[PDB]
């Protein structure tokens, strides 16, 4: 988990402000919005990166372009690339990062309102974050469903096929015969109802806090290039302080910056280390990491 700063520039002062805000608003909570950047330190291979075995396996299987692996039409025409990706990225193959544990720490301190994640690694949940506080915007491998009729299936049959050599005779629905796949949201598919429903509730929650425990929304490791998830930042109340911890300034933080926006160019794990330091929760955090 060892981390280092992205550059010679120190982000400790910027992180100090966050800790200061939380110290001034002790009964406040934080909403996190996270992306693939928070799992990079976990060693998860990026399917879009030529340096990975996953990318080359997909290329050899004749996948047209990386994101076609998450395309419904392509999947129906050829499920092998996706099965191949699922074998390598199946939840449980990796371990949570220091940042994932930070979410658990905030939960323990009761300062976590919600974590909206567009990742499908389920690492927030694996790290101990409670189901009620997690919004897996793009689904997960916890359930499987028929892409045709929607019949639900336990995730085990699909997972069992990933261990066969070679992978063939893909899982089909016992009702309509169409392909069954993990409950992951593919491009072109709608997100689970809980996404919009919970954001509707947390949006009112945010606004009501403004008029008095001022909240904080921290966006971490996401390029904000996938909608509707990417619409969340701009929908945050102007009177609610936004924080962006990302190697680059992206999305609404770039297009329409706000006076109170706090941008922190830092690795998520280093950010976690620094924030825990400024909050003085090193002891409790150390316990979690060693647990």
């Amino acid at each position: 988990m060892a981390s280092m700063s992205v550059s010679t520039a120190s982000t400790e002062m910027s992180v100090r402000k966050i800790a200061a805000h939380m110290k001034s608003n002790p009964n406040a909570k934080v909403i996190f919005m996270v992306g693939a950047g928070i799992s990079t330190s976990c060693g998860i291979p990026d399917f879009r990166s030529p340096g990975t075995g996953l990318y080359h396996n997909l290329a050899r299987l004749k996948l047209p372009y990386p994101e076609a692996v998450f395309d419904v039409d392509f999947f129906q025409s050829d499920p092998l690339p996706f099965y191949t990706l699922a074998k390598e990225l199946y939840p449980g193959n990796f371990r949570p990062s220091k940042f994932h544990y930070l979410l658990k720490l905030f939960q323990d301190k009761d300062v976590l309102k919600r974590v909206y994640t567009q990742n499908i690694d389920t690492l927030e949940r694996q790290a101990g974050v409670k189901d009620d506080l997690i919004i897996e915007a793009h689904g997960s491998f916890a359930h499987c469903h028929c892409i045709g009729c929607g019949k639900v299936y336990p995730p085990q049959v699909f997972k069992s096929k990933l261990a066969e050599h070679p992978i063939k005779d893909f899982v089909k629905c016992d009702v309509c015969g169409e392909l069954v796949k993990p409950a992951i949201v593919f491009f072109g598919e709608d997100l689970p109802d809980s996404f919009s429903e919970t954001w509707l509730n947390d949006s009112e929650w945010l606004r009501e806090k403004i008029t008095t425990q001022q909240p904080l929304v921290i966006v971490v490791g996401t390029s904000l290039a996938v909608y509707p998830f990417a619409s969340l930042p701009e929908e945050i109340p102007r009177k609610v302080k936004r924080v962006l911890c990302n190697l680059e300034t992206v999305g609404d933080f770039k297009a329409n910056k706000r006076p109170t926006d706090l941008i922190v160019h830092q690795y998520s794990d280093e950010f976690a280390e620094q924030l825990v330091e400024e909050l003085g929760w090193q002891e409790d955090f150390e316990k979690i990491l060693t647990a």
């Binding site: 072109g188 598919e189 709608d190 290039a225 509707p228 619409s231």
Partner: peptide
């Protein structure tokens, strides 16, 4: 509700 998963 936002629509289907997509870019842009």
């Amino acid at each position: 509700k936002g629509g289907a998963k997509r870019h842009r």
